[PDB]
């Protein structure tokens, strides 16, 4: 819903300084970006600004959850700066803080065409407006300090842009408290909301949802809301053992069992049933002797049970084939969460096999949407997508200027 908000295509940025909230919270290992998808997604708004005559583009984001303590040794945005520079073909001035004297001066009037990335916002308790101390307790933020944090951010540009879709569910100071006459939705913000609004309000049918993940209790709302829209639905990952234990009394050994979500499984199945949704659960498995990448692997079916002391970490071949048949009937697919422990090659086969079917479906004309160009749309969303789909309002979209 961006018919009534100001958006970038209309903002005149010529000779103007631009502050842009983006989502550069990327997955990392050992100070190394493991996935630069969130960085690439931000490129077209940045380019447009630079191309249209921007004095400067100042970029701000969080990374991980450092809970209002500075952690530049574990959670620094510096690695992103180096990545952004290559992608952009431009120099990137990395600043080691996000508010204050040094930052405001550095951004006061940069050389024409400067791209500037600030340090992790969540190094300041005032970004969330709450935090944890070094003894792990409930530290309250100070209103006067929040007003100062925000007022410092409002200095780094003449105009504001939110291209931060992956964070749009967060009412944080960088997301709703920036004070400037013009607050615009960037091109990503627009692309994301257009794909998910078309997918949900004029779906191509048959419409398939694939939902995977570890726990059930936290997806009740998602599943319910999806169950009113979709023609089919796959339920996969460690969340399916809860389902199979209740609907089939499968012996799951040490596989994950959501004791709470177990009590409403019945109601989900009942609403699916009355709505005519076909529920596709896994029927076989790759089992492991412990929660380890280098565990000993086995195999099991619903008929056979998983032996005791062993746990299920990936669906198997016959489950793969079942998933594929739903993929074949679909004209639209929304996929959220893995069907197994794809992190680990031994347990990655189900997700790979499945990605292939979804890719092949795209070639025939299926609209395929996956969570954060072989598919229609790879979302940066993940957690914000889930809230989009639970029907809830996005603090990041609501705070943009009205026309
Ligand atoms: N036994 C298990 C354990 C984890 N998982 C997957 O569960 C995913 C995360 O669980 P989650 O529900 O808390 O988060 P999402 O899948 O919604 O992103 C991890 O990426 C694992 O690959 C699984 O499918 N089966
Ligand atoms: Mg969750």
UniProtKB/Swiss-Prot annotation:
Residues the record lists as Phosphoserine modifications: 1, 3, 202
Modification comment: Phosphorylated at Ser-202 by MAPK1/ERK2 under hypoxic conditions, which promotes its mitochondrial targeting.
Residue numbers of N6-acetyllysine PTMs: 10, 47, 74, 85, 90, 96, 130, 145, 198, 266, 290, 360
Statement: the UniProt record of this protein carries the keyword RNA-binding: no
Binding site for ATP: 214, 219, 238, 312, 343
Enzyme class: transferase
Residues carrying Phosphotyrosine: 75, 195
Region (Mitochondrial targeting region exposed following cis-trans isomerization by PIN1 and recognized by the TOM complex for mitochondrial translocation of the protein): 37-42
Effect of residue 284 to V: In PGK1D; with chronic hemolytic anemia; variant Herlev; 50% of activity
Cofactor needs: Mg(2+)
Residues at which ADP binds: 213, 237, 342
Swiss-Prot/TrEMBL catalytic activity: (2R)-3-phosphoglycerate + ATP = (2R)-3-phospho-glyceroyl phosphate + ADP; L-seryl-[protein] + ATP = O-phospho-L-seryl-[protein] + ADP + H(+)
Modified residues (N-acetylserine): 1
Biological-process GO terms, alphabetical: canonical glycolysis; cellular response to hypoxia; epithelial cell differentiation; gluconeogenesis; glycolytic process; negative regulation of acetyl-CoA biosynthetic process from pyruvate; negative regulation of angiogenesis; plasminogen activation
Pfam families, per database record: PGK (PF00162)
Sites bearing N6-malonyllysine, chain numbering: 130
Chain sites annotated for binding Mg(2+): 214, 217-218
Residues annotated to bind (2R)-3-phosphoglycerate: 22-25, 37-38, 61-62, 64-65, 121-122, 169-170
Location in the cell: Cytoplasm, Cytosol; Mitochondrion matrix
Impact reported for residue 87 to P: In PGK1D; with congenital non-spherocytic anemia; variant Matsue
Record PTM N6-(2-hydroxyisobutyryl)lysine, positions in chain: 96, 215, 219, 322
Family: Belongs to the phosphoglycerate kinase family.
Role: Catalyzes one of the two ATP producing reactions in the glycolytic pathway via the reversible conversion of 1,3-diphosphoglycerate to 3-phosphoglycerate. Both L- and D- forms of purine and pyrimidine nucleotides can be used as substrates, but the activity is much lower on pyrimidines. In addition to its role as a glycolytic enzyme, it seems that PGK1 acts as a polymerase alpha cofactor protein (primer recognition protein).
Other facts: Dysregulated mitochondrial targeting of PGK1 may contribute to the elevation of aerobic glycolysis seen in tumor cells, a phenomenon known as the Warburg effect.
Descriptive protein name: Phosphoglycerate kinase 1
Native source species: Homo sapiens (Human)
